[PDB]
Amino acid sequence: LPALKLALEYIVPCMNKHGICVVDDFLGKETGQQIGDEVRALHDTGKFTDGQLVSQSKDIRGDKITWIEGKEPGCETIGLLMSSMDDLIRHCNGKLGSYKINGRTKAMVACYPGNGTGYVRHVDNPNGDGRCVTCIYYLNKDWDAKVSGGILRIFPEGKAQFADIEPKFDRLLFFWSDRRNPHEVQPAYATRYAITVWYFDADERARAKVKY
Ligand SMILES: O=C(O)c1cnn(-c2nc3cc(Cl)c(F)cc3[nH]2)c1
Ligand SMILES: [Fe+2]
């Protein structure tokens, strides 16, 4: 699908009504794997962090991250993922809420190591830091959450219920970054890779430059 069709027939009507959207088979199996390769090559070559400190001798650590600009050697299909997320957002064109989305972060590549850690419930942006849309791309080939866990559970707020989102291969996830969408990753018992880019609201981002 061209970014424009997906954006206007799906992303926008979905985001404005539910505030969470899932695009399956986003880039297709060939490109999907290429990203998998590049992400694994980052892991294998020691670029990831530490890991999130879950339990504070031999402590327990969680998701490792790396920021990727997209032009790095060995990171080109990720760069290309990013450009294609950017195309989607641009073809929304101030149709996402009242938002004027003028920029974004580098890409946070995440590796959950499969040691039963998840990510405690959280709000990507609680204090008004600029971030208004969270875009996540999952690269997990033949993921079974019944066996490996790692489901992402969102608590869209003002709602009795949650939405469980499996970190399926070639899945792309959009959701409002603020207090409307509290979420968590359930414990992952297998390596779980994801890539996140956050989109900035012009105004909120513009005010945050002085406050932080
Ligand atoms: O892979 C996931 O499904 C997932 C869901 N939220 N999450 C998560 N990682 C994050 C990292 C940072 Cl620095 C942050 F500020 C907010 C974050 N939110 C990852
Ligand atoms: Fe998050």
Curated annotation (Swiss-Prot):
Effect after changing R61A: Reduced C-terminal ODD domain (CODD) hydroxylation of HIF1A
Subcellular location as annotated: Cytoplasm; Nucleus
Modifications the protein undergoes after translation, according to the UniProt entry: S-nitrosylation inhibits the enzyme activity up to 60% under aerobic conditions. Chelation of Fe(2+) has no effect on the S-nitrosylation. It is uncertain whether nitrosylation occurs on Cys-132 or Cys-135.
Region (Beta(2)beta(3) 'finger-like' loop): 54-60
Residues binding 2-oxoglutarate: R192
Binding site for Fe cation: H122, D124, H183
Consequence recorded when altering C132A: Little change in enzyme activity
Record-listed S-nitrosocysteine modification sites: C14, C21, C111, C132, C135
Residue intervals of the Fe2OG dioxygenase domain: 100-201
Effect in UniProt of substituting R180H: In ECYT3; decreased interaction with HIF1A and EPAS1 and decreased enzyme activity
Tissue expression per record: According to PubMed:11056053, widely expressed with highest levels in skeletal muscle and heart, moderate levels in pancreas, brain (dopaminergic neurons of adult and fetal substantia nigra) and kidney, and lower levels in lung and liver. According to PubMed:12351678 widely expressed with highest levels in brain, kidney and adrenal gland. Expressed in cardiac myocytes, aortic endothelial cells and coronary artery smooth muscle. According to PubMed:12788921; expressed in adult and fetal heart, brain, liver, lung, skeletal muscle and kidney. Also expressed in placenta.
Domain notes: The beta(2)beta(3) 'finger-like' loop domain is important for substrate (HIFs' CODD/NODD) selectivity.
Purpose of the protein: Cellular oxygen sensor that catalyzes, under normoxic conditions, the post-translational formation of 4-hydroxyproline in hypoxia-inducible factor (HIF) alpha proteins. Hydroxylates a specific proline found in each of the oxygen-dependent degradation (ODD) domains (N-terminal, NODD, and C-terminal, CODD) of HIF1A. Also hydroxylates HIF2A. Has a preference for the CODD site for both HIF1A and HIF1B. Hydroxylated HIFs are then targeted for proteasomal degradation via the von Hippel-Lindau ubiquitination complex.
Subunit-level organization: Monomer. Interacts with ING4; the interaction inhibits the hydroxylation of HIF alpha proteins. Interacts with PTGES3 (via PXLE motif); thereby recruiting EGLN1 to the HSP90 pathway to facilitate HIF alpha proteins hydroxylation. Interacts with LIMD1. Found in a complex composed of LIMD1, VHL, EGLN1/PHD2, ELOB and CUL2. Interacts with EPAS1. Interacts with CBFA2T3. Interacts with HIF1A.
Associated disease: Erythrocytosis, familial, 3: An autosomal dominant disorder characterized by elevated serum hemoglobin and hematocrit, and normal serum erythropoietin levels.
Stated name of the protein: Egl nine homolog 1
Organism field: Homo sapiens
Lineage: Eukaryota, Metazoa, Chordata, Craniata, Vertebrata
Gene name of this polypeptide: EGLN1
Covered range of the whole protein: 188 to 403 of 426
